[PDB]
């Protein structure tokens, strides 16, 4: 069930909001995981919670422009959610 995934995403977003700049050593793997759960969604999982916790670990760590080139498909999949 996706309940465990939603729960761990919500708690990890709350944790990233609690501890800022002490999670920069983890944001890369979190990005690689959460973009593969957001984009190329093989299942109909909750995308709003993933989007929220993704936006929550970039306002605390300060990952502003680097992910736009480290993951060249981030802007396109962020823009598609307005038409899908």
């Amino acid at each position: 069930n996706p309940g465990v995934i939603n729960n761990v995403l919500a708690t990890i977003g709350e944790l990233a909001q609690v501890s800022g700049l002490e999670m920069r050593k983890w944001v890369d793997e979190l990005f690689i995981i959460i973009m593969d759960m957001l984009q190329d969604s093989s299942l109909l999982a909750k995308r709003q919670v993933a989007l929220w916790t993704l936006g929550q670990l970039v306002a605390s760590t300060g990952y502003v422009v680097e992910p736009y080139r480290k993951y060249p498909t981030l802007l396109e999949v962020l823009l598609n959610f307005l038409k899908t």
Binding site: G20, G62, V64, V65, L79, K83
Partner: protein
């Protein structure tokens, strides 16, 4: 008094009402106005983003400016995150398109809590951008505001040696715009009174100042 007549159903109305409510410490109304402006802008964003990204940048800059108001809330709420958001602001401003028209409004929504005398690393770049874009009369105003005293009124008094980056940029602007002779003597005097300064600075621990002064002298 002016915002009371702006329509409440448009994006600019919600944006300005959020800014006004934020000015008087209303952290609950401002969030609601921000969340309303979010969708009021998302409408035209998804209407315009279907063509191209370069066409939707005009709404993306506004969405970015709107998403920087929550960081103003965090600035006025938690004193421990002030320097961190003040640094991510500078890190995020380096990604936008170098145009004075949007830089002005971004810095205005940003200076709601940060005076120009508190983060001048981002205002010197703004002055240089205004100088390169042919708008030298705005670069002069920005440099004068950063300095604190307008040297164009006292043609005989020297330039304020404090804030060395600001006076260096001011001398560059004076050389570029109008006068190629006065800026030369000004730079000579500045180099003299700046080299006569590092001698009395025997720094044993703070080594983040001597190297910067040496680079500036170079």
């Amino acid at each position: 008094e002016y915002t009371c007549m702006i329509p409440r159903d448009t994006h600019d109305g919600a944006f300005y009402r959020a800014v006004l409510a934020l000015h008087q410490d209303l952290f609950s109304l401002a969030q609601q106005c921000i969340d309303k402006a979010r969708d009021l802008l998302d409408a035209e964003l998804t209407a315009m983003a279907g063509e191209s990204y370069s066409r939707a940048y005009g709404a993306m800059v506004s969405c970015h400016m709107l998403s920087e108001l929550e960081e103003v809330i965090q600035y006025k709420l938690v004193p421990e995150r002030r320097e961190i958001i003040r640094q991510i602001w500078w890190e995020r401003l380096q990604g936008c398109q170098r145009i004075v028209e949007d830089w002005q409004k971004i810095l205005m929504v940003r200076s709601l809590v940060v005076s120009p005398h508190e983060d001048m690393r981002t205002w010197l770049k703004y002055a240089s951008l205004c100088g390169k874009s042919g708008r030298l009369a705005l670069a002069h105003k920005t440099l004068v505001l950063l300095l604190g005293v307008d040297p164009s009124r006292q043609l005989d008094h020297p330039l304020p040696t404090v804030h060395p980056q600001v006076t260096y940029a001011y001398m560059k602007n004076m050389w570029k715009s109008a006068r190629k002779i006065d800026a030369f003597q000004h730079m000579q005097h500045f180099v003299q009174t700046m080299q006569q300064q590092a001698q009395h600075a025997i720094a044993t621990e703070d080594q983040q100042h001597k190297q910067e002064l040496h680079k500036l002298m170079a």
